[PDB]
Design an enzyme around this catalytic site. Structure first.
Site, PDB file in Angstrom:
ATOM      1  N   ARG A   1      -6.022 -15.879   9.812  1.00  0.00           N
ATOM      2  CA  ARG A   1      -7.023 -16.846   9.372  1.00  0.00           C
ATOM      3  C   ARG A   1      -7.574 -17.679  10.530  1.00  0.00           C
ATOM      4  O   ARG A   1      -8.766 -18.010  10.536  1.00  0.00           O
ATOM      5  CB  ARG A   1      -6.469 -17.702   8.231  1.00  0.00           C
ATOM      6  CG  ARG A   1      -6.326 -16.918   6.915  1.00  0.00           C
ATOM      7  CD  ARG A   1      -5.405 -17.614   5.938  1.00  0.00           C
ATOM      8  NE  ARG A   1      -4.024 -17.554   6.408  1.00  0.00           N
ATOM      9  CZ  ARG A   1      -3.006 -18.166   5.817  1.00  0.00           C
ATOM     10  NH1 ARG A   1      -3.219 -18.909   4.742  1.00  0.00           N
ATOM     11  NH2 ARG A   1      -1.774 -18.046   6.305  1.00  0.00           N
TER      12      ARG A   1
ATOM     13  N   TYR B   1       0.847  -1.194   0.000  1.00  0.00           N
ATOM     14  CA  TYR B   1       0.000   0.000   0.000  1.00  0.00           C
ATOM     15  C   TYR B   1       0.885   1.247   0.000  1.00  0.00           C
ATOM     16  O   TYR B   1       2.087   1.159  -0.247  1.00  0.00           O
ATOM     17  CB  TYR B   1      -1.060  -0.097   1.103  1.00  0.00           C
ATOM     18  CG  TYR B   1      -1.957  -1.295   0.877  1.00  0.00           C
ATOM     19  CD1 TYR B   1      -2.784  -1.361  -0.237  1.00  0.00           C
ATOM     20  CD2 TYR B   1      -1.961  -2.371   1.765  1.00  0.00           C
ATOM     21  CE1 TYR B   1      -3.604  -2.471  -0.474  1.00  0.00           C
ATOM     22  CE2 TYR B   1      -2.772  -3.485   1.536  1.00  0.00           C
ATOM     23  CZ  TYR B   1      -3.592  -3.524   0.432  1.00  0.00           C
ATOM     24  OH  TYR B   1      -4.392  -4.618   0.187  1.00  0.00           O
TER      25      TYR B   1
HETATM   26  C1  FMN Z   1      -9.021 -12.220   4.235  1.00  0.00           C
HETATM   27  C2  FMN Z   1      -7.758 -11.524   4.657  1.00  0.00           C
HETATM   28  C3  FMN Z   1      -7.820 -10.175   4.943  1.00  0.00           C
HETATM   29  C4  FMN Z   1      -6.668  -9.508   5.326  1.00  0.00           C
HETATM   30  N1  FMN Z   1      -6.749  -8.162   5.597  1.00  0.00           N
HETATM   31  C5  FMN Z   1      -5.622  -7.493   6.017  1.00  0.00           C
HETATM   32  C6  FMN Z   1      -5.704  -6.145   6.349  1.00  0.00           C
HETATM   33  O1  FMN Z   1      -6.772  -5.511   6.288  1.00  0.00           O
HETATM   34  N2  FMN Z   1      -4.568  -5.508   6.751  1.00  0.00           N
HETATM   35  C7  FMN Z   1      -3.363  -6.179   6.836  1.00  0.00           C
HETATM   36  O2  FMN Z   1      -2.369  -5.574   7.213  1.00  0.00           O
HETATM   37  N3  FMN Z   1      -3.270  -7.518   6.533  1.00  0.00           N
HETATM   38  C8  FMN Z   1      -4.408  -8.169   6.130  1.00  0.00           C
HETATM   39  N4  FMN Z   1      -4.323  -9.505   5.825  1.00  0.00           N
HETATM   40  C9  FMN Z   1      -3.034 -10.209   6.087  1.00  0.00           C
HETATM   41  C10 FMN Z   1      -3.261 -10.808   7.513  1.00  0.00           C
HETATM   42  O3  FMN Z   1      -3.314  -9.832   8.568  1.00  0.00           O
HETATM   43  C11 FMN Z   1      -2.197 -11.833   7.896  1.00  0.00           C
HETATM   44  O4  FMN Z   1      -0.931 -11.241   7.674  1.00  0.00           O
HETATM   45  C12 FMN Z   1      -2.297 -13.129   7.085  1.00  0.00           C
HETATM   46  O5  FMN Z   1      -3.616 -13.630   7.215  1.00  0.00           O
HETATM   47  C13 FMN Z   1      -1.270 -14.195   7.508  1.00  0.00           C
HETATM   48  O6  FMN Z   1      -1.389 -14.488   8.892  1.00  0.00           O
HETATM   49  P1  FMN Z   1      -2.048 -15.890   9.329  1.00  0.00           P
HETATM   50  O7  FMN Z   1      -1.208 -17.037   8.806  1.00  0.00           O
HETATM   51  O8  FMN Z   1      -2.119 -15.849  10.841  1.00  0.00           O
HETATM   52  O9  FMN Z   1      -3.428 -15.938   8.683  1.00  0.00           O
HETATM   53  C14 FMN Z   1      -5.463 -10.194   5.457  1.00  0.00           C
HETATM   54  C15 FMN Z   1      -5.410 -11.547   5.166  1.00  0.00           C
HETATM   55  C16 FMN Z   1      -6.559 -12.216   4.785  1.00  0.00           C
HETATM   56  C17 FMN Z   1      -6.490 -13.685   4.476  1.00  0.00           C
END
Ligand code: FMN
Length: 356
Positions: free
Chosen positions: A316, A177
């Protein structure tokens, strides 16, 4: 030494545990970027997280192209966020607003303006709009007046987040971003004081952070970085030379906590051969360091036990396990998340995942 179940202070935010809900865009706000009442239930269901970082929340229409995502620039948005935040606090939770400017990652049919960025580049592929997918448009490189205006927008958004009752803010400086587009040499081709050497590429992050902290205090300000791996066409060819100095700058400015989204070669939401920078960043940023991406519960416990992180943020897993900390503590199996409803509308795959 502290475990994931021990409390931690993020500035003045007394979190009951170190199991953080990472920021997750879900698209359950309205077309005016005003939060909808269903969002109150969603966040209240997840209030056992030590800290909730909200979905990315637009600081302006110029910086918000994501359909049905919320903003926090207007009084109407502040008023709609108030009961959402209050419901979390009523359950003893803590919640911070992730402040978003999407930079080149928007489409003009949503924002009403050309995408803006560090340089006049085009993100690869196509963008999700209200009419479906459209090819990305070439951004325009922001000028001095734009920078002044965008800093005002960050200031207003941070004050508005506090006015809505949020315990603090996190600056979204990640994931390709606007700020990340300045940090990384893959996207920043400027020849002025915002481009070139790492100190110049950090300058936009520095100025955004300085303005936010002068409005609400450095102790109420966190930052997210994503140092390693291409995200949305944004990569640095030598990330250690810019992201380690960026973290040191945030430490010196008094930033209360730092979250790192870190990818790996087998990553399940983004993959890369660029190594994780957390070990180096841990040496220069000394306040709470929150790590994120592809952590099993076991790996999260090991990271704290080996002194690699102070807390772990889960994305997630929190989508589909609103009671994630309790499931961890009690040895209960985790429900899988349905990617089909990550970004759809309504309660399905949003508020209908049960607690155990
Ligand atoms: C559906 C979805 C929405 C996300 N929205 C954001 C967001 O708004 N801002 C952000 O910094 N990262 C966002 N991410 C990245 C997540 O915060 C996170 O880094 C990613 O899910 C990996 O972490 P995890 O393995 O615990 O899921 C999003 C990821 C997913 C899958």
């Amino acid at each position: 030494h502290p475990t994931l179940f021990d409390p931690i202070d993020f500035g003045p935010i007394h979190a009951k545990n170190r199991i953080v809900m990472s920021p997750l865009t879900r698209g359950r706000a309205d077309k005016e970027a005003v939060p909808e009442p269903i969002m109150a239930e969603y966040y209240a269901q997840r209030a056992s997280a030590g800290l909730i970082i909200t979905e990315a929340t637009g600081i302006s229409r110029e910086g918000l192209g994501f359909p049905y995502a919320p903003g926090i620039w207007s009084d109407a948005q502040v008023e709609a966020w108030k009961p959402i935040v209050a419901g979390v606090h009523a359950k003893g939770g803590k919640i911070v607003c992730q402040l978003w400017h999407m930079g080149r990652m928007v489409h003009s049919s949503v924002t009403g303006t050309q995408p803006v960025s560090s340089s006049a580049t085009t993100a690869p592929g196509e963008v999700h709009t209200y009419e479906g997918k459209k090819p990305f448009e070439q951004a325009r490189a922001i000028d001095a007046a734009d920078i002044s205006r965008i800093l005002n927008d960050y200031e207003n958004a941070a004050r508005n987040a506090i006015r809505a009752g949020f315990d603090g803010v996190q600056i979204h400086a990640a994931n390709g971003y606007l700020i990340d587009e300045f940090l990384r040499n893959g996207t920043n081709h400027r020849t002025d004081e915002y481009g070139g050497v790492p100190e110049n590429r950090i300058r936009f992050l520095k100025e955004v952070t300085e303005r936010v902290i002068a409005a609400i205090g450095a102790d109420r300000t966190g930052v997210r970085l994503s140092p390693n791996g291409d995200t949305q066409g944004c990569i640095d060819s030598a990330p250690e030379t810019v992201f380690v100095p960026a973290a040191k700058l945030l430490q010196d400015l008094g930033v209360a906590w730092l979250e790192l989204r870190e990818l790996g070669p087998n990553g399940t939401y983004g993959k890369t051969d660029q190594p994780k920078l957390s070990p180096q960043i841990r040496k220069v940023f000394l306040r709470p360091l929150v790590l994120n991406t592809d952590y099993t519960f076991e790996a999260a416990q090991t990271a704290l036990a080996e002194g690699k992180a102070d807390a772990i943020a889960f994305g997630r897993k929190f989508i589909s396990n609103p009671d994630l900390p309790e499931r961890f503590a009690r040895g209960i199996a985790l429900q899988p998340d349905d990617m089909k409803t990550w970004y759809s509308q309504g309660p399905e795959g949003y508020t209908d995942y049960p607690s155990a």
